[PDB]
Amino acid sequence: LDSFGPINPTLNTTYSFLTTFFKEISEVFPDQFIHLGGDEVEFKCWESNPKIQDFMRQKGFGTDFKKLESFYIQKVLDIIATINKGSIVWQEVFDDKAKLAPGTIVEVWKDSAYPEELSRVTASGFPVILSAPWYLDLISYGQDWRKYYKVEPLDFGGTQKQKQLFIGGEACLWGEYVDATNLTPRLWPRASAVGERLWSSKDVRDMDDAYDRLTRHRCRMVERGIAAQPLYAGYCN
Amino acid sequence: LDSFGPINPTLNTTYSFLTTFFKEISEVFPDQFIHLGGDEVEFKCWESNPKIQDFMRQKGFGTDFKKLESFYIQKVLDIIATINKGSIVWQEVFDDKAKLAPGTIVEVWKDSAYPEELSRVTASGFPVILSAPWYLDLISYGQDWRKYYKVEPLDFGGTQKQKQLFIGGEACLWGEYVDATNLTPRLWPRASAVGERLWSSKDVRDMDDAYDRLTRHRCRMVERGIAAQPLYAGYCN
Amino acid sequence: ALWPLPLSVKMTPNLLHLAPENFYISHSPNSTAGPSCTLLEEAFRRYHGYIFG
Amino acid sequence: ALWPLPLSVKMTPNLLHLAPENFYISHSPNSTAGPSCTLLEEAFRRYHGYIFG
Amino acid sequence: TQVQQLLVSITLQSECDAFPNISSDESYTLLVKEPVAVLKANRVWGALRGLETFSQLVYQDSYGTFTINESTIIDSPRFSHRGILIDTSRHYLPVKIILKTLDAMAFNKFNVLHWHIVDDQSFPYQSITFPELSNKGSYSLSHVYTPNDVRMVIEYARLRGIRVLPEFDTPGHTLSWGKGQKDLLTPCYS
Amino acid sequence: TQVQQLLVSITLQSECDAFPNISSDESYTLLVKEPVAVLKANRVWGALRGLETFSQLVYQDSYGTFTINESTIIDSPRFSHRGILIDTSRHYLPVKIILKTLDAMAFNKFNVLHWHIVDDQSFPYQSITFPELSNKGSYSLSHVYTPNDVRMVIEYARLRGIRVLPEFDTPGHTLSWGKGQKDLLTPCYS
Ligand SMILES: *[C@@H]1O[C@H](CO)[C@@H](O[C@@H]2O[C@H](CO)[C@@H](O)[C@H](O)[C@H]2NC(C)=O)[C@H](O)[C@H]1NC(C)=O
Ligand SMILES: *[C@@H]1O[C@H](CO)[C@@H](O[C@@H]2O[C@H](CO)[C@@H](O)[C@H](O)[C@H]2NC(C)=O)[C@H](O)[C@H]1NC(C)=O
Ligand SMILES: CC1=N[C@@H]2[C@@H](O)[C@H](O)[C@@H](CO)O[C@@H]2S1
Ligand SMILES: CC1=N[C@@H]2[C@@H](O)[C@H](O)[C@@H](CO)O[C@@H]2S1
């Protein structure tokens, strides 16, 4: 329906480009991990392409484009492993049955049944990062800092071993409706709710006390040049 | 349940204070109209007060505190009329059956069945202002400028005469969650949707064309020092 | 890129140019307003800045 | 007004005062870091500004 | 090729020194032609709207050249009350951000600033006859609008053809009024 | 009464010149006492967190007097990956607002900037080996992150104990990649 779709995973020029490209990235960014993405891959374009249809039957993927996605992603993960970096991946890569090397971090972003996603990912042995309940781009009326604060990330089903695989989370501010004019007030102090939940003890959840310290903290951010938005009616100083 | 409730409408000191006060307001603000409010008056405090209970039976208001509210508001409207200014009032004053002098503008803010509110107000002879569908403090994800833009304010039931009583509207940015750090991006360009709907012709409603001109207009606001937020992905210049 | 869209807009393909230091906004001689009109004078000056700035 | 709330906080009622032009943040003599540590030196200086500014 | 001048013609008594009101005439016509463009309006209010529109017609081409198309615009508003409500009680807004809002309102042809100046949480309006309303009801002494702050906002608004509609909400929404005016509010038994 | 000094003691190899990673030790203890307060941490990363906490304990009383309570704090994070995702493809974000975000992250003890640097709408990452990715994929030439912009963000982040986690999303979310890399994207028949 569009003009161009996803990266063409059947061409050797693709993987040759990605090799050279990711090698540059392994040098520019010193962090051990590179996020390869893998979210929301559309198959309609691959399905409608004759050369891809040919490639699909060449190795028995039938009409299952999850296998072509897996095939693509496995080659990229292998490129990351060869340059001695770790890989992070959005949950779709795990859900669509790609073969991930041990160590691969899976970032859980889909808000539907996310605890059960956490169980599945951890049960399969993989380290997990949670972002699903902390989509700060999804704005709403009122004190939504509380709903982010009330999340207890380890309330999913699993053994201690699985819960040890939960390494943390991220508060996400996607950019469709965000730029320099509105980023800071949208981000802070709503992201401060997630920061306490990820830093402080599990049992730190008194809402009144959280409100008391966060308004004062927010005023502190403002004093330091961060235009963090209010929690409710009031003033600073 | 609280410590203090609404203004005490049974005391002569109240109306003597309001007289002196509103006289000052009639001098400070040159506009013909003064908005007297009258929204969300709580009766529990009046109901729980013995002196008010006494006053209630003194002129047969029974247990109907709408009559005490009406009694209060009518005295304030009379003060405004005596200083030769017009009055504007939130819909509750009209809904709770207060006697309004001809000319009194009624501002319709309740989002439930607002067209039928417009019909009632206009059918009774009063000029009306609409704010109900344009609560800009009620933020939500995405292109909510469109829902404000798609409002056709004269789609309520009534004769031409009633529709001539509809004098306009207001986009409201209530302050519970708004201060200097976030007012401008929240307000603009979402309020620009309401501005076109209130300025331009009724039949100006092509969404694609509105999107085209509003992104460019929004970029214009930014160039002129107004940090208006984006409509969608893109850039300026 | 008009906002709000004016009631009636009729344009030609003929382009005309403006020179910032040789473009003035002034009172037409038949007008009821003149230099005494602070409101119009301030508007002339700030719109000059908006057009060119 | 701590955010995030630290794991363990124990305070006394004893108040102490600080003098901006007579308060320094420095390396303890037993530390593995010293003046060579740009990261700690820059942090010392900017937190001095945050505490007093 | 050159537009050397934009001439502005007010046809009737200008209303230059007056405050705008509900029935103010905001109609205008704009004739863009060479060498002199003409903005014609019954009153000052329409000329202000027309200046905004003229500025939206001028653009710079790919080489930086200031350009405008020959054109004719006839314009007048569908409704005469076009408002923005701001609330300076739930949070104090500095005068500067109110002035900026008025600038943005002008760019959008809004003509009413509905100033919800006081409410339960704070009373920043400094009253001359009742000094204790703000002295005890404001968030602090730097969260107040002086008589001069109020005049400045009114004048700034008038210069853009904007009416300042004050709201002093009663009988509800008045908790801050009780700090400075004793015996005004009803005490709650509970 | 006077705290004259805050002494900072790093116990193990400081990691002063290193980049932080998932297992970095961010624990510390803070002893506030007179005349010398002490911040102790295994590494640099914990000292940075402890400096933030120390600053949150100092306050000014009603007369402007800088005050702090005698106290002891033991602290270490519940989880080690504490991230903020920013998206600079849907809109370009100037380097300055990324640096400000890192400052706010430090004040909140966040330790990962998840930089969703590219996506469908634009490709601001300037690649040395593939110059056409940004030259054709960026919104414009001033909406690009140079190698030096990238280094600056990485260094600025490191100085606050923040890891910069780059995301170069594939195979979906890659429309901007196709402008500069020919034959990479799948053409759609329809
Ligand atoms: C304003 O004038 C310009 C320039 O003539 C108009 O633009 C062009 O229109 C002509 C004929 O309609 C086309 O051949 C060109 O492709 C257009 N652009 C260029 C670069 O010349 C423009 O349409 C006019 N504005 C309006 C709305 O009438
Ligand atoms: C920090 O020290 C102050 C000052 O001693 C503490 O505040 C006072 O606590 C005492 C006894 O607990 C009370 O009598 C006072 O009313 C409190 N305030 C004043 C003005 O002295 C404060 O509690 C200490 N901080 C903590 C959390 O321990
Ligand atoms: C992972 C994800 N991929 C999508 C992003 O491309 C969007 O920007 C975001 C907006 O909420 O939603 C999901 S989260
Ligand atoms: C009239 C109105 N009275 C109320 C206000 O006090 C609130 O601030 C506003 C918030 O949406 O809601 C209604 S609108």
Which protein residue has the closest C-alpha to ligand 2 atom 21?
A: D13
Q: Domain tally for chain B?
A: 1
Residue of F nearest to A164 (CA): F79
The pair of structure tokens assigned to F28 is 């510390």
A151 and A197 Cβ atoms separated by less than 8 Å: yes
Pocket of ligand 3 (CB under 6 A): A 39-40, 90, 109, 135, 137, 174, 176
Report which bound ligand comes closest to the CA of B107: 4
CA distances from E150 to E98, E157, F6 (A): 11, 11, 49
Elucidation technique:
X-ray
Distance (Å) from the C-alpha of residue F87 to the closest C-alpha of chain D?
25
Q: Map tokens 């195979």 to a residue.
A: F171
Residues near A71 by beta carbon (within 8 Å), at least 6 away in sequence: A9, A59, A61
Q: Relative to the alpha carbon of E59, which ligand is closest?
A: 1
Q: Which residue of D has its CA nearest to A196?
A: D4
C24: which 2 tokens? 């003035």
Q: How far apart are CA B79 and CA B24, in angstroms?
A: 12
Rounded to the nearest angstrom, the distance between the alpha carbon of D20 and the centre of ligand 4 is: 46
Ligand 3: centre distance to CA A173 (Å)? 9
Ligand 3 probe mutation, A36, A39, A129, A135, most atoms within 8 A of CB: A39
- Inter-chain touch A213–D6, beta carbons under 8 Å: no
Q: Are F190 and A48 a contacting pair at CB < 8 A? A: yes
- C-alpha B146 to ligand 1 mean position (Å): 29
Is B202 in contact with E115 (CB distance < 8 Å)?
Answer: no
Judged by phi (left if over 0) then psi (alpha if -120 to 50, else beta), residue E162 lies in: beta
First to last CA, chain E: 78
Domain parsing of chain C, residue ranges: 1-53
The count of C-alpha atoms lying within 13 angstroms of the C-alpha of C31, restricted to the half-sphere facing its C-beta, is: 24
Boundaries of domain holding A100: 1-237
Å from F9 to nearest chain A CA? 22
- Closest ligand (CA of F59): 2
Token pair recorded at residue F64: 């402007």
Closest atom of ligand 4 relative to the E119 alpha carbon:
6
Contact indicator for F161, F113 with CB cutoff of 8 Å: no
Ligand nearest to the CA of B177: 4
Angle separating helix axes A12-28 and A66-82, nearest 10 degrees:
40
From the list B31, B73, B188, which residue is nearest E164 (CB)? B31
Residue E5 CA, chain-centre distance (Å), reads 28
Query: Could you state, in order of their start, the residue ranges of all structural domains in chain F?
Result: 1-76, 77-190
In E, residues 44-73, which contact B (CB 8 Å cutoff)?
56
Q: The tokens of A144 are what?
A: 């939504």
Q: Which chain C residue's Cα is nearest to E155?
A: C39
Joined tokens for residue A98: 């790609």
The sign one gets for the Cα dihedral A9, A13, A16, A19 is negative
Question: Residue A181 is nearest to which of B138, B181, B185, comparing CB atoms?
Answer: B185
**Per-residue three-class SS string for F88-147:** CCCCCCCHHHHHHHHHHHHHCCCCEEEEECCCCCCCCECCCCCCHHHHHHCCCCCCCECH
D46 Cβ contact list (under 8 Å, min separation 6):
none
Compute φ and ψ for A25, nearest 5 degrees: -65, -40
Known active-site residue B40? yes
B174 Cβ below 6 A of ligand 4: yes
Reported structure resolution in angstroms: 2.5
Closest C-alpha among F159, F101, D5 to residue A221 = F101
Phi, psi torsion values for F47, nearest 5 degrees: -65, -35
Of D1, D3, D53, the CB nearest to A192: D3
Shortest CB distance from F143 goes to which of B230, B233, B235? Answer: B235
If you measure from the C-alpha of residue E117 to the centroid of ligand 4, how many angstroms do you get, rounded to a whole number? 13
State how far the Cα of A25 lies from the Cα of A21, in Å rounded to an integer: 7
- C-alpha–C-alpha distance, residues E185 and D10, integer Å: 44
Which residues are F125's β-sheet partners? F145
Atom of ligand 2 nearest to the CA of D12: 28
Chains E and D: 3 or more CB pairs within 8 Å of each other = no
| Cα separation, B6 vs E180, whole angstroms | 15
Chain B residues within an 8 Å CB radius of C53: 223
What are residue E40's phi and psi, to 5 degrees? -120, 135
Atom of ligand 2 nearest to the CA of D15: 2
Q: Which residues pair with A128 in a beta bridge?
A: A106, A166
CB distance B3–E188 less than 8 Å?
yes
Q: How remote is the C-alpha of B7 from its chain's centroid?
A: 20
Test B41 with E172 for CB contact under 8 angstroms: yes
Are B195 and B181 within 8 A, CB to CB? no
CA dist., res. A187 & res. F68, Å (int): 30
Residues 6+ apart with CB under 8 A from F116: A35, A174, A175, F85, F86, F87, F88, F89, F167, F169
* Strand spans (E) along E77-150: 81-87, 112-116
Measured distance CA(E140)–CA(E136) in Å, rounded = 8
Q: How far is the CA of B220 from the centre of ligand 3 (A)?
A: 29
Q: Give kind and range of the element (H or E) at residue E158.
A: helix E147-158
Q: How far is E87 from chain C (nearest CA, A)?
A: 25
Q: Which residues in C26-52 are b (16+ Cβ under 10 Å) and which e?
A: bbbeebbbeeebebbbebbebbbebbe
Helices within chain A (DSSP H only): 12-28, 44-47, 50-58, 66-82, 91-95, 114-123, 145-149, 160-164, 183-187, 190-199, 207-223
* Cα separation, A65 vs A80, whole angstroms: 23
Any residues with CB less than 8 A from the CB of A196 and at least 6 apart, and which? A149, A204, A210, D3, D4, D5
DSSP F45-101: HHHHHHHHHHHHH-EE-TTS-EEEEEEEEEE--S-SEEEEEEESSSS---HHHHHHH
CA distance readout (Å), E93 to A159, B170, C28, E136, F180: 52, 19, 40, 18, 48
Angstrom distances, CA of residue B63 to CA of B4, B68, B98, E66: 20, 10, 16, 71
Q: Is the CB of C11 under 6 A from ligand 1?
A: yes
Q: Say if CB E101 and CB B183 are below 8 A apart.
A: yes
A197: its two tokens: 């939940």
Alpha carbon distance F99, F153 (integer Å): 7
Could you tell me the maximum CA-CA distance found in chain A, to the nearest angstrom?
70
- Cβ-based neighbour number of residue A195 at 10 Å: 28
Name residues whose C-beta falls within 8 Å of residue F175's C-beta, 6 or more positions apart in sequence.
A4, F120, F121, F185
B47: exposed, middle or buried (Cβ count in 10 Å: 0-12, 13-18, 19+): middle
| DSSP β-bridge partners for residue F137 | none
